[PDB]
Design a protein around this ligand. Structure first.
Ligand SMILES: O=C(Nc1ccccc1)c1cc[nH]n1
Length: 290
């Protein structure tokens, strides 16, 4: 793209290379994602107007030469790197709370407009020096699908996938985002992925081992889902006090609502923002090492 100067490769997304680039005329530093279906282009174009302080701004969609480039506002780190970096001591709780709180506001805005993310994970949550956190790649899964592998063959993580997706639900809802963020919330607290599955069945059985194998009691309709098997093992549900120590009762309360099996009972982003866990929410500045 003649209007951009590629500064460095920052990464490899599910769809293609991600470049840090500068706009040869505006002087703007952006993130440039290289990714043609008529449908995809209309979908992405609606994303241009879905603007919120906690959603990485899509600056521009450039379709040229059967090539597709998305131009995003640039943020200097993602949450996965920040968590790696905060391994020894953990992300402090007030900062975990502010991030979750901001992320929920993000989801509440998108969701109210009926946009799902569908592939939330720490690599697409981006952070700046001001204490902000923002969701990247919102709405791209609807436009482009979610591949078992990326363009580089790197395996798409299953770790944050809602169970109604793993059980083959075709028509899942906004609740699938709530589930992922719940998994991400647990991970920040404990410094270990909640459910790090390495196949769909491992992913599901890991969920079952912690949350209880789901039945008709906790999840009406579950036994009628496409990939449900009466032969699944029947595991007992563990207490959250064991799962996310040393998270407090309000935290554990909210986490459990975000991880309800039935997507209809799963707490919405909007209700979550009202939960007492956020009574004392503040906005700390992290220390970043740019
Ligand atoms: O990927 C982006 N930025 C980034 C991520 C990790 C490390 C350094 C920079 C990005 C995507 C959209 N804006 N920024």
């Amino acid at each position: 793209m003649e209007n951009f100067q590629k500064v460095e490769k920052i990464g490899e997304g599910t769809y293609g290379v991600v470049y840090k680039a500068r706009n040869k005329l505006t002087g703007e530093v952006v993130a440039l994602k290289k990714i043609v279906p008529s449908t995809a282009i209309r979908e992405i174009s609606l994303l241009k107007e879905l603007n919120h302080p906690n959603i990485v701004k899509l600056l521009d969609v450039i379709h040229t030469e059967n090539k597709l480039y998305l131009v995003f506002e640039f943020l200097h780190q993602d949450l996965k790197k920040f968590m790696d970096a905060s391994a020894l001591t953990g992300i402090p709780l007030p900062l975990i709370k502010s991030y979750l709180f901001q992320l929920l506001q993000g989801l509440a805005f998108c969701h109210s407009h009926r946009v799902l993310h569908r592939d939330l994970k720490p690599q697409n949550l981006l952070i700046n020096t001001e204490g902000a956190i923002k969701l990247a790649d919102f709405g791209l899964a609807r436009a482009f699908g979610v591949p078992v592998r990326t363009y580089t063959h790197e395996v798409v993580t299953l770790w944050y996938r809602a169970p109604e997706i793993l059980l083959g639900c075709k028509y899942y809802s906004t609740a699938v985002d709530i589930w992922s963020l719940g998994c991400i919330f647990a991970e920040m607290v404990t410094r270990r992925a909640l459910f790090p599955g390495d196949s769909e069945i491992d992913q599901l059985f890991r969920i079952f081992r912690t949350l209880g194998t789901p039945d008709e009691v906790v999840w009406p309709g579950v036994t009628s889902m496409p990939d449900y098997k009466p032969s699944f093992p029947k595991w007992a549900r563990q207490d959250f006090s064991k799962v996310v120590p040393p998270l407090d009762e309000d935290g554990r309360s909210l986490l459990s609502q975000m991880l309800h099996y039935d997507p209809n009972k799963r707490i919405s982003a909007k209700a979550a923002l009202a939960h007492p866990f956020f009574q004392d929410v503040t906005k700390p500045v992290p220390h970043l090492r740019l």
